[PDB]
């Protein structure tokens, strides 16, 4: 991705908040070192510049033509897709709002972006679930119609101190309300078919329950795996790479509708006065935006594998991402730093979960995935837990955007902590315990969770 222009917009996107985050009743009690993202380049934990940091991801762009193992890749994922009988007919509009089978009802706490956050419109004013009404909406989009500009936020979350001092906060590009509904309308059937069958042909894992979804990854990945980190994924996205999408919904039946690839491929944005132009990356708050990020993920990981390897049968090539996360799988070993080198020459990094020779080859006790780690229970080896680290938990736990939803919050860290034992179950609770209102929470058992885990299925 390459910012291609840059100038004074005719609007004025409002400066952010300071941050909702602040140490919780836990922060003490808990070890860990993240802090609230930078927010605005007058933060006194700035070592730099803080535009010239969040902008930097955008590393540019590999121009180019689509070559020849991105049309086999394209091919095989294809073929890959094809026995889910993807529907390429559009949903009706109350379905693409209000929801349906296989799409959530649309998310009503995210921007409605432009131009309505700059007149006062919410999405509250347009949506009302009871009724279903679809009304409001219509009129809008005859208003305003679509392929309107991105705004973008400085995103508010934790980021390790090494991110905050370097101002490496995670930015929110908002599609409008407008583009989010007609490409729900466009593409609400494809992201059902994904959202209902996470696994090694839609190779995506958007929308799974780690809880009950872990189970299956090691027998869809039942070979030598490998697994990749990106940095940088969205926005080291080439235009390439976004030609190989709309061919791989061409050859699913798509016609125009790849029209809505190219407004992910070349996009206007708005921060404070200014509207830039990016060309590649990835935007971020797009109503597709992990669905397309994974199918291009697919479509990468072929690629370099075909690219690398002369006498590659993708058949026996199996791969699970969500977004620039992947795990993946084929019968023989491969040479995953092999593929990352490639990877490099289209304008990616990444890193594989295999450091080198040295390295103790990737496996299931060693591997993660969405942070999460891979491990067989005790009484029943064929149910995989998800384990979330207790350094993530702990990072969590120590702050909050209010103070209020605490039994919330740490219920949820509860779901998530007693995958790592019992034993470690119990001194987390235990810690929790420590101080007054950890004292009176209401806190799962773990007998409680194992039994609620085990009927998940």
């Known amino acids: 991705g390459e910012i291609v222009s ?7 996107i409002n400066a952010p908040a300071k941050t909702k985050l602040q140490p919780s009743v836990f922060h003490q009690v808990f070890e860990g ?9 007058k933060d006194p934990r700035l070592k730099t510049d ?3 940091a969040i902008f930097s991801k955008y590393t540019g762009n590999k121009i180019m033509l689509m070559d020849e193992y991105m049309e086999e890749a394209v091919d095989h994922y294809v073929g890959c897709l094809e026995p889910l009988d993807i529907s390429i007919d559009p949903i009706p509009l109350e379905s693409a709002m ?3 089978d296989g799409l959530e009802a649309l998310d009503l706490t995210t921007s409605a972006g432009f131009p309505y956050l700059l007149q006062g ?14 009304t409001e909406m219509t009129r809008m989009l005859e208003k305003y119609g679509v392929d309107l500009p991105f705004v973008t936020f400085v995103k508010d979350e934790l980021r390790s101190r090494e991110k905050v001092e370097k101002g490496k906060s995670r930015l929110i590009e908002a599609s409008s309300l407008n583009d989010s509904v007609a490409m729900r309308v466009a ?5 059902a078919t994904f959202h209902n069958n996470p696994g090694t042909a839609t190779g995506s894992a958007v929308g799974c329950d780690p809880d009950v979804f872990w189970s299956k990854i090691p027998i869809l990945l039942n070979g030598e795996i490998f697994a990749f980190d990106y940095t940088g994924y969205d926005a080291s996205l080439s235009p390439v790479w976004f030609a190989c999408l709309k061919k791989v919904l061409i050859k699913l039946g798509y016609t125009h509708q790849t029209s809505f690839i190219d407004y992910l491929c070349h996009s206007v944005h708005l921060y404070k006065d200014r ?6 990356g990835m935007p971020s708050g797009s109503s597709g935006t992990s669905i397309f990020n994974t199918m291009i993920n697919n479509i990468i990981i072929r690629t370099l594998l075909i690219r690398v390897y002369k006498g590659i049968d993708l058949d026996q090539f199996k791969m699970i991402a969500y977004g620039d996360d992947v795990i993946a799988s084929y019968p023989h070993k491969i ?7 490639a990877g490099k020459h289209y304008g990616l990094i990444m890193t594989p979960a295999d450091k080198g020779t040295s390295f103790v080859d990737t496996n299931w006790e060693n591997v993660t995935f969405l942070k999460r780690y891979f491990r067989a229970d005790d009484q029943y080896p064929f149910l995989i837990h998800p384990v979330m680290p207790m350094k993530e938990i702990h990072e969590s736990i120590r702050w909050t955007k209010d103070p209020r939803n605490t039994q919330d919050h740490v219920r949820s860290l509860c779901y998530l902590a007693w995958h790592n034992g019992e034993e470690a179950y119990n001194e987390f609770c235990r810690k929790i315990r420590s101080v007054p209102v950890g004292r009176a929470l209401t806190l799962p058992a773990y007998s409680s969770l194992r039994r609620k885990w085990l009927d998940s299925f």
């Open 121 to 134: 419109k919410k999405k509250r004013d347009i949506f009302n679930r009871q009724t279903r009404d679809t």
């Open 33 to 41: 070192s993240k802090e609230p993202a930078v927010l605005n380049s």
């Open 187 to 191: 593409f609400g059937n494809l992201y």
């Open 50 to 52: 803080f535009e010239e």
């Open 275 to 280: 509207k830039y132009i990016v060309n590649g």
């Open 6 to 12: 840059n100038e004074k917009s005719g609007v004025c």
């Open 98 to 100: 209000y929801g349906m």
């Open 335 to 341: 040479d995953p730093g092999l593929l990352a080198e």
